[PDB]
Amino acid sequence: ASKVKQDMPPPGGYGPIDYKRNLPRRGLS
Amino acid sequence: QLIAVDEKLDITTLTGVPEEHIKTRKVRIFVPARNNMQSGVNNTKKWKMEFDTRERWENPLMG
Amino acid sequence: GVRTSPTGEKVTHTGQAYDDGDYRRVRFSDRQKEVNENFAIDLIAEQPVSEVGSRVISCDGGGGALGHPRVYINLDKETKTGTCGYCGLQFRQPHH
Amino acid sequence: TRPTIRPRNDVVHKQLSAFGQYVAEILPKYVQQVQVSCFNELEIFIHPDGVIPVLTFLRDHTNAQFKSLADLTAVDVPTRQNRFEIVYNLLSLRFNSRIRVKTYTDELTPIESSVTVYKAANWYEREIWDMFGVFFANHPDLRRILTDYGFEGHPFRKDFPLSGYVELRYDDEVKRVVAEPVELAQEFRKFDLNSPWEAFPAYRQPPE
Amino acid sequence: NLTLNFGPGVLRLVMELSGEMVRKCDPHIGLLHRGTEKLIEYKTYLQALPYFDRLDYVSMMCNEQAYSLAVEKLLNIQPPPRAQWIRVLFGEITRLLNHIMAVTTHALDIGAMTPFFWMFEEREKMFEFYERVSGARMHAAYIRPGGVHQDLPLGLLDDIYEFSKNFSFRIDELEEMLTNNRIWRNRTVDIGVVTAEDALNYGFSGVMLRGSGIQWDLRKTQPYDVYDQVEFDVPIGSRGDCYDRYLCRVEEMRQSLRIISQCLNKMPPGEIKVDDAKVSPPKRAEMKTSMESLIHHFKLYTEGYQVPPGATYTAIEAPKGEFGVYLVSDGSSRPYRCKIKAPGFAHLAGLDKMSKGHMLADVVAIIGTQDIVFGEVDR
Amino acid sequence: LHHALIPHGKGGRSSVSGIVATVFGATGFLGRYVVNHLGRMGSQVIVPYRCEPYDTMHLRPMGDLGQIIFMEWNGKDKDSIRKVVEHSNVVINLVGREWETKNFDFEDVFVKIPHAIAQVSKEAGVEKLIHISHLNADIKSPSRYLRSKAVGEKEVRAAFPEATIIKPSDIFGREDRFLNYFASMRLGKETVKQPVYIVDVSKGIINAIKDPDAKGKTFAFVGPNRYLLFDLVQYIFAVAYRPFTTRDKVERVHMSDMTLPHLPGLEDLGIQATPLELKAIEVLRRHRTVKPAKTVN
Amino acid sequence: TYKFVNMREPSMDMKSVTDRAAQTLLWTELVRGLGMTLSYLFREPATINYPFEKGPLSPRFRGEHALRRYPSGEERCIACKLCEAVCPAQAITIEAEPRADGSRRTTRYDIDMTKCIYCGFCQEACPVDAIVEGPNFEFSTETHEELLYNKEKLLNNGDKWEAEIAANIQADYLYR
Amino acid sequence: GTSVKPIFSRDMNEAKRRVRELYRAWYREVPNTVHLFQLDISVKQGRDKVREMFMKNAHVTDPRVVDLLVIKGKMELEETINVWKQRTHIMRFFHETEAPRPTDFLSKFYVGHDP
Amino acid sequence: ELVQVLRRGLQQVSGHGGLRGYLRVLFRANDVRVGTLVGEDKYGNKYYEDNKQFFGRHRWVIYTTEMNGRDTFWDVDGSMVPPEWHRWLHCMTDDPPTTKPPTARKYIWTNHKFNVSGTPQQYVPYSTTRKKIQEWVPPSTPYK
Amino acid sequence: SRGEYVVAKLDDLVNWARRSSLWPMTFGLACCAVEMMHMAAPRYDMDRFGVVFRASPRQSDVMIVAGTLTNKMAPALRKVYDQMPEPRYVVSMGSCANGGGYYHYSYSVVRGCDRIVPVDIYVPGCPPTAEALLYGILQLQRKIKREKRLRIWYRR
Amino acid sequence: ASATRVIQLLRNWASGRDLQAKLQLRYQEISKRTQPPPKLPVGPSHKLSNNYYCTR
Ligand SMILES: CCCCCCCCCCCCCCCCC[C@@H](O)O[C@H](CO[C@H](O)CCCCCCCCCCCCCCC)COP(=O)(O)OCC[N+](C)(C)C
Ligand SMILES: NC(=O)C1=CN([C@@H]2O[C@H](COP(=O)(O)OP(=O)(O)OC[C@H]3O[C@@H](n4cnc5c(N)ncnc54)[C@H](OP(=O)(O)O)[C@@H]3O)[C@@H](O)[C@H]2O)C=CC1
Ligand code: SF4
Ligand code: SF4
Ligand code: SF4
Ligand SMILES: [Zn+2]
Q1: Contact F/C (≥3 CB pairs under 8 Å)
Q2: Cβ contacts (< 8 Å) between H60 and chain B: which residues?
Q3: How far away, in angstroms, is G65 Cα from ligand 3 center?
Q4: J31 assigned ligand-binding residue
Q5: Which of E162, E208, E236, H9 is found 20 to 30 A from E19 (Cα to Cα)?
Q6: Ligand 1 mean position, distance from CA I28 (Å)
Q7: Which 3 state secondary structure label does DSSP give E305?
Q8: What b/e sequence results for D101-121 when a residue is b if at least 16 CB atoms lie within 10 Å of its CB, and e otherwise?
Q9: Closest Cα partner for F23 from F122, F107, F170, F129?
């Protein structure tokens, strides 16, 4: 009767995860 | 290139064992007897070396 | 059911207590001796015997998977009662 | 088979068998046996005199070029006349393959140091000497690396007791740490876990 | 030429100095030798598992995974897919923890002490993940030679995802504090330069190889659990110095975030341990209901499973390099011999060559860039 | 012999020696050595302390787990002494003080406390009692210190007829007052001293505990060599590389050590007394930054 | 696939050279680092107010060991010695005999907490949930001896923590 | 037969030559060790200890065992000279804290079951 | 802005029962935050929550000034929390014991005790087994 | 009396000063040192109690043994302890330091650091959590609060 | 975070990024500490037939 229930990702999956380096350039010549 | 020396092997001075744990010990070389509680014989295949039993006493704490 | 040794120390549920001449009592001076006040034997003796109208019944200690392994107890002998070897609960057929 | 059983790889098995035959053919002076395990691991058993030649060939040959020494250790088997076996684990980055070379020695026969073939062997041979008492000839500086200074015996030998022979404590009378014979408050409990009713029929030995 | 002793992680280091130059560097080890390999011979395989937590005690589940893989190879069994995905996810988390510890400790020894706190907050969060999955923060013992001990709790994946979407900013802050700082570059650039051939001959592995331009990674060349089903890049150095290794470690942190994302989005259903009760213990309900399950539980927790006779060498891409186990079985339930291979051993052996012609302050930087933890070095 | 008190093991840290010793004054100079010797062979040691525990912390690693027990007490209450000596078969009295305080003069320390300890130990059924007095103790001594020592010795003998009396002479050691007092000065030719080593005295106490027939005996613990004070101080200053306590201690150091030929000594307990030359460097190395003194015998 | 971390060639035109000279002389990157530290200065710290606030814990977390009992009040332990056999540190010492009513019960159950590794193998080996590792972790001691637990101490720990222990077991037993 | 591979010495004469060289080196080193470690022993008793340690192995008739013993003693000397040891390691040769174990039958009978 | 933070500070002062209670909590817990009262403990502890604080600071306990036998106005410690509020306070569950109480047993301690190390009620270890070898008792009557 | 009240207040002041600034010197021998660092991490902030981070042995007040003590390492630890100023305390952290732990039956491991130095507080765990170590440190603070030196001096 | 707008802009300018987007302190976005019961399915060898151990 009872169906399987365990830890799973939500339908459609998780959102993207940022991993690339982000060191911005402020600005003064 | 080869010594060809005639002498029985003796490594007591190299093992680091204390003096009184070499001369006063008596090892027993035997095939262990089958545990009569069971019919299996797989524990009676090899030879075993064990040392003579020494004193065991009760710790005053924890017994 | 904690009893007191003639020396004065509480006798634990295992029945041990240091003798009068035992020097090891000195460890309890200026301190105390831990004794558990709930004796399991008495507590299980207080449990009433369950009445079941079946020749063989099973006991798992209650709670399902939170108890002990399920075992079956025969109740054919009328002189005594069936006792669980895990939990200590007693069972009996309705004689007369 | 079924999803609880590890799959086999016949291609790697054949490749390792072919390369073992190749190496054995090139060096018949030292190679005594070649084996390939069911999980695709290649072992080459050699005479002790061939440690430097075999290792140099495996490091420098164009078809082998095992440029990395993964690990070097010893195993103690008291029942053999040659008590210790020396195990070399090598890795080839060019061909993405691993090889194992085994030899043997006893308490009194030195094994040639392989520090000229692999610089990594320097500390491994020191550890082998410290733990098993195996002497390596022509080592740059052979000495204890793991045990305490003045420690007697080689602990990784099978007949060395688990807790050793001496124990340390601080003595107030001499105002220093002293060594005394070991005395356990609770003796280590020896457990007899080996059961009868032998488990793996494929490894059954002749009854002689 | 004066000789001085830097006495007591814990390390004794004997040097002879000619002014400011380091002429000879002789490290003395064994201050944390506990005889792990001899102690393993007196335990069953399950009993011997927790030693690997304490071997390299910054990367616990990686050592667990290496030992479990060795035992699985000797047993001729395989874990279920969900167990493998959990193993890889927690291995990447462990890599993040280890690289945080290494980079922040290396910065702290040089004199930069603030990123240590900044990233130890994240380390505490990952310790919370460890505690939730296993009940222990550090000495977890979660990865077993049949899979994993327990399934994940019902809300662990969402919290892991929430953690992973904010870690890149922490890496960015660390890079802002360290990457372009001129003092950090002066402390790290062209320090401890090692050639590719010398690294190969000295037994180096991991970052110590990749910083010299050697294109090698065990997760790519010899994948073991599901690493062929995930996509990531391998950072490669160009100068073989401390700065290149620092950049490589930061890039591995970013790639570990990438792999963690992939693992979270592709977690499969199913069981967590091999469905073979003669190796993996059964469930508690089965043990308390079925006769065979109770017998197998009793035998597995008293004697343990017997391993068919044989010897194997199993290595993984640990966060510090190639971590290997040479495991010998005699057919019983206790390992006959267990040799433990640690990359830190070879790295510390090469420390002497790496420090030739350098200042006294450069040896600290070389030690920090070698990522030396003495638990695995001494064993 | 009360089976729990039957000795077991090989005389080590976790062995059982059958000795349950209560060591009064174990927080002092001789007390640490006595407790160390008792605990290295695996005996149960009760350490009664009137001082702060922090000052007794150094005695903790001298025995295995559970073998050293600390209890508060004070010399003016017999109940504390009783509760400390209930379960012991050996009682050792090391309580002493070289000066008088506003709460304890020489009388309480050297007569009242030893007498109370001996009486309580006799009432509690303690098998052995070892009391420490001075070699130069006598009733007609000019100093109140030695008069109190003699009176306390007499009262201890009266209360505990089977007590072992030990009379050392100017114990020297690392924490010993005698070597240190002379070297911290940075008279003579008429007073003579015969100092004794601390380890010798501790081993003598242990052997007297072991000795069955040393029940009601009196011992005099003296060194091998007998020195004039001027030469001894010159030797002290030479060893320390140095250029060459109100009224009672100066009087005590100005009076010569007695000779007790009839009293048994360390040789009867199987101990060879160590000369001062072997341990003087050990004691006096810390006073720095070879021609041993002449002896009269 | 592989990536290059330090394979950038600086530009050699006059503008980029002037920019690098301005960075060298005016200390721009050091000001960036100072700004990062200043930004951290103005955010909320991560400190919790121990002991008034506590770190988050889970039901699975292993704490001080305790001996449990059945709702009737009898102890669950049946002296099978499986926990003692599985203990990787040999921290458990067990002695048993038939009880006065014939029950299979222990007379000695000792756990050396200075030998224990807190792995939790004993609680997963127990077939009757008798030995558990409860959630208490603040049980530091001033002496070595009080960390040598006997059966009375463990039974007292069980009676002391049974409510939380049972709640945690109810929360976690479906994962076991 | 009984042909074995040498370590350093083909026969007993050169093995004894190495033994004498090691003894000379230890004898020379004793005063420097006594002074440098601030030991409370004398030079005479240190040299007596060296002689006793050398004499414990006087029964060896195998040149390979002899030269392995020489190698071990030379490692010991290297540890002593380079001050890799501390004072405790040097003083461990004297067993000052160990109570003497009597040899006669009656004492062993009285103390316990150990022969 | 500044007026808002000053007003919240004055509200924190007023919400502790005035200046006296404000100073009392400031010197007892080094914190002056105000949260809703989750429940009351039988030994005197008070438990608060604030879901707008970050995780870890959203639950705290104000210890009682007098537990079993000691004055805990200054000397407080974590072992003073009973097991049910221990479970709630360590975030092992989202439900306080007030809403759902723990299961009642006859053997569960009615009075929680804190850590008693360095105290006459400390635990003193001992062997719980009986003598194994029984000695022979000689007769009291002389043989001859 | 006047003196009995003055010595009590002066003892209280000295004890408060000593326990309000404890400067620890930590032997990071093994993996208990990691939890020690996690106690210095922002979540717990051992500094905020007055317990500084990484004090020098010459100006340290408490020793924390965090990890396995081997026979090779014992003399160095004893020397470092001997170099500490007199008002010193020792905290044993972890099962290895407490009694040997998982290495207890080893040929090269001291079975508890209390064989080498006296120990004031034993912190159990393998490893103890940083919060458990904080509890142990606060217990040591209470123990320091409980002592009374000038009372003993006045009564002697 | 209970940070005023002026402090928000100041810290944003000092670090040079948007910090409220990615905060390092957990809030209500985390999972509940009380969770529903799981089910934990069984493995492939839980069949009632054609499941002889000699074949696996
Ligand atoms: C002008 C002349 C100067 C001469 C030299 C003076 C030196 C400076 C002294 C002046 C400063 C006073 C010290 C302040 C101490 C009070 C601290 C008090 O609040 O502590 C609490 C009160 O405890 C004690 O009751 C206080 C004892 C302080 C000393 C008592 C009187 C001392 C005055 C005597 C001064 C005479 C000097 C004589 C020589 C000149 C307990 O807190 P605690 O347990 O820690 O922390 C627990 C943590 N919690 C709170 C989060 C749970
Ligand atoms: N040169 C020598 O040292 C020789 C010593 N004498 C005698 O030998 C014995 C030991 O001498 P020694 O160890 O050097 O002296 P110490 O001063 O070093 O030790 C004296 C001991 O007695 C205790 N004690 C002193 N007074 C009292 C008291 N009123 N109440 C309770 N306890 C007290 C001390 O405790 P606390 O720390 O609290 O003060 C301390 O433990 C003493 O009886 C001494 O008189 C024999 C010949 C000389
Ligand atoms: S938790 Fe592990 S080490 Fe501790 S008693 Fe249980 S099985 Fe033994
Ligand atoms: S606690 Fe559990 S596993 Fe251990 S002996 Fe008792 S019933 Fe068996
Ligand atoms: S006590 Fe436990 S956690 Fe700490 S170092 Fe030892 S094994 Fe690791
Ligand atoms: Zn039942």
Answers
A1: yes
A2: 10, 13
A3: 9
A4: yes
A5: E208
A6: 15
A7: coil
A8: bbbbbebbbbbbbbbebbbbb
A9: F129
